[PDB]
Curated annotation (Swiss-Prot), chain B:
Effect of residue 88 to P: Abolishes interaction with SYTL2
Name of the protein this chain belongs to: Ras-related protein Rab-27A
Annotated localization: Membrane; Melanosome; Late endosome; Lysosome
Parent-protein start and end of this portion: 6 to 188 of 221
Catalytic activity reported: GTP + H2O = GDP + phosphate + H(+)
Molecular-function GO terms, alphabetical: G protein activity; GDP binding; GTP binding; GTPase activity; myosin V binding; protein domain specific binding
Tissue: Found in all the examined tissues except in brain. Low expression was found in thymus, kidney, muscle and placenta. Detected in melanocytes, and in most tumor cell lines examined. Expressed in cytotoxic T-lymphocytes (CTL) and mast cells.
Binding site for GTP: 38-46, 92-96, 151-154, 181-183
Documented effect of changing residue 45 to N: GDP-locked. Abolishes interaction with UNC13D and localization to lysosomes. Increases interaction with DENND10. Disrupts late endocytic pathway homeostasis
Keyword Hydrolase tagged: yes
Listed EC numbers: 3.6.5.2
Domain of life: Eukaryota
One GO term describing the cellular component: dendrite
Organism the protein comes from: Homo sapiens
Disulfide bonds: 141-206
Length: 203, 206
C-alpha cells in the first residue's frame, strides 16, 4: 500500500485515457503532444485549465501523478491545418517525480513553469531544463519559459530581465503568464506549437 | 509502500539510459522494443537475463520499478530469410502492484509483450487473465502481439499448472504459448524469436 487505491486508479484512468486517444489517432490530421513541468504549485494545472476552458480555480488541488487535457486547434503561420492537442500536466512533487519524468519522453514540446512570486520556482528552472534534455527522446527539445502568476504584480519576486537573461542564455522564449486571467497563456502555447511544427524541417 | 527516494534514483537512471538509447536511433536497422509483464516472482528479470547473457541467478532480487536489458540480434524472416540487424530493448517491469502505474506507463513504449506466469504458482496463472485486459486497455496498437510463457519449467516437481489449461487459454486469445525456463534456457530464445517474428512481420504490412 502506502499509495491510496483511489490515488492509483486515477493514474490508471489517466493512463487508460491516453491509450484510447492514441489508438484512435492511428486508426483530425495531426496530433501534437505538449507537456507542462515546473515545481509543484507554480500553476501547471491552473494554466492548462485556463487555456483549454478559460476557467480558473483559486483552491489548490495538487495534481496526483499525471493528467492531461485536450483541445482542438487550427494552426496558421496560407492554409488551415487541424490539430488535436494533448497537454500533459505533470505533478510537480517529489513523490511523483519518477512518474512525471517518465512522460517527458512522449512530449514534442515542453512548457516549463515557474511562479513569478517564488524565487525557488525560478531557481529550480536551471535543473528542470537539464532534466528536460536528459530525459527527452530528441536532443534539442523545444521549451517555452513561463513566468506564471503575472497577475500578482503585488507579490512578484523574479526580476523580468533576470528571467529574460536566463531565457536568452538557453535560447528559449519567455512569457509572463497569469492562469488567473489568461494573460499570454494562449500566445505562449501557440508559440510552442509554432516551434514544434517548424521542427518538421525537410531536407 | 510509497517509493523510497533511493528507489527513485534507480528508476530514473533507467529512464536516463532509456532516453539516451532513444536519442541514439536518429543520431541497427530497426529499433524493436518489447516489454515483460507478469506477477512478481514469475521470472521476468531472469527470463531476460538468460536471454541477453545466457546467465541465471537464483536469489530473488525484485525489480525496483522498471529496468531494461539490451541485445543486438540478427533477425531473419520466416522458406526464405535475409538477415536484418535488430536492436532490441527488453523492457522489464516489476510485478508488485505498488509499481503498477509506473509499469503500465510503459505499455506505450512496447511493440510486443512477453506475458509471464509461474508454472509452480497457480495464482499467477489465473492473474494472467487480468494482465491481458490490462494490455488491452493500455497498448497503443491494439490487438498487441503477446507471447504467453509458462516460466520455471525446470521445476517439474514443484509444478502445479496443467499444461492443458494453459494451451487452451492461449488459443482462446490466439496468442503463442511456450513452457520456458529461465534456469536452463529452454524455450527462452524460441519464444522471444516468435515475438520478434510477430512484430517484424507487422512493421511488414504497416
Ligand atoms: N493568482 C494566481 N494564482 C494562481 C495562478 N496559477 C495558479 N494559481 C493558484 O496557485 C495554486 C497552484 O496552482 P496549480 O495549477 O494547482 O499548480 P500546479 O503547478 O499544478 N501544482 P501541482 O504540480 O502540485 O499540481 C492554486 O491554488 C491555483 O489557484 C495564477 O496565474 N495566478
Ligand atoms: N528454477 C527457476 N527459478 C526461476 C526461474 N525464473 C525465475 N526463477 C527464480 O524465481 C525468482 C523470480 O525472480 P525474477 O526472475 O526476478 O522474477 P520477476 O518476475 O522479475 N519478479 P519481480 O516482478 O518482483 O521483479 C528468483 O528467485 C529466481 O531465481 C526459472 O525459470 N526457474
Ligand atoms: C523532438 C521529439 C519529441 O520531443 N517528442 C516525442 C516523443 C515520443 C513520441 S512517440 O509517440 O511516437 N513515442 C515514442 C515511444 C512510445 C511513444 C512514447 O512516447 O511513450 C509514451 C513522439 C514525439
Ligand atoms: C504497438 C504500439 C507501438 O508501436 N508504440 C510505439 C511507439 C513509438 C515507438 S519508437 O520509439 O520506436 N518510434 C519513434 C519513431 C518511429 C517510431 C516507431 O517505432 O514506428 C512507429 C515504438 C513503439
Ligand atoms: Mg497540478
Ligand atoms: Mg524482476
Amino acid at each position: 500500500s502506502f499509495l491510496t487505491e483511489e490515488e492509483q486508479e486515477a493514474i490508471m484512468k489517466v493512463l487508460q485515457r491516453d491509450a484510447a486517444l492514441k489508438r484512435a489517432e492511428e486508426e483530425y490530421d495531426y496530433l501534437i503532444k505538449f507537456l507542462a513541468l515546473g515545481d509543484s504549485g507554480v500553476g501547471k494545472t491552473s494554466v492548462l485549465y485556463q487555456y483549454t476552458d478559460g476557467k480558473f480555480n483559486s483552491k489548490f488541488i495538487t495534481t496526483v501523478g499525471i493528467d492531461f487535457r485536450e483541445k482542438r486547434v487550427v494552426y496558421r503561420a496560407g492554409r488551415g491545418q487541424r490539430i488535436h492537442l494533448q497537454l500533459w500536466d505533470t505533478a510537480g512533487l517529489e513523490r511523483f517525480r519518477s512518474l512525471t519524468t517518465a512522460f517527458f519522453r512522449d512530449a514534442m514540446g515542453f512548457l516549463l513553469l515557474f511562479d513569478l512570486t517564488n524565487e525557488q520556482s525560478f531557481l529550480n528552472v536551471r535543473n528542470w531544463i537539464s532534466q528536460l534534455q536528459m530525459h527527452a527522446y530528441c536532443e534539442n527539445p523545444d521549451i517555452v519559459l513561463c513566468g506564471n502568476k503575472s497577475d500578482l504584480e503585488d507579490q512578484r519576486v523574479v526580476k523580468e530581465e533576470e528571467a529574460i537573461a536566463l531565457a536568452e542564455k538557453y535560447g528559449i522564449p519567455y512569457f509572463e503568464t497569469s492562469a488567473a486571467n489568461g494573460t499570454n497563456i494562449s500566445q505562449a502555447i501557440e508559440m510552442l506549437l509554432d516551434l514544434i511544427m517548424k521542427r518538421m524541417e525537410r531536407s
